[PDB]
Amino acid sequence: ELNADSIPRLKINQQYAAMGNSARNDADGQFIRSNLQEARWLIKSLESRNDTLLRVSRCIVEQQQAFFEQGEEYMKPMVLADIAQAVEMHESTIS
């Protein structure tokens, strides 16, 4: 379980959201649309990063469970490629 307090969270400006269509100015509407698109892309990227981190943590804990049971003295060797196999992303993302 990740630290929920440490987990970042962003909110969409509902008041700003409810003022895009009602705008009678083309420039203001275009700016609002661009800002909304950028915010949506950023939120999607943040959520994807959080999900990938959670999946990587789960895979490591699956690997670390063997290590934790074996203890520090008998810790099993681990490879970056071995963990990347446990996930679906490229090893660059894992690194």
Binding site: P8, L10, K11, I12, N13, Y16, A17, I32, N35, L36, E38, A39, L42, L46
Partner: peptide, 17 residues
């Protein structure tokens, strides 16, 4: 540092809270 970058972006983006 990611939090600071997010704060800077939210300062840039007025439609984010």
């Amino acid at each position: 540092e990611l939090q600071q970058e997010l704060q800077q972006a939210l300062e840039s983006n007025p439609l984010l809270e």
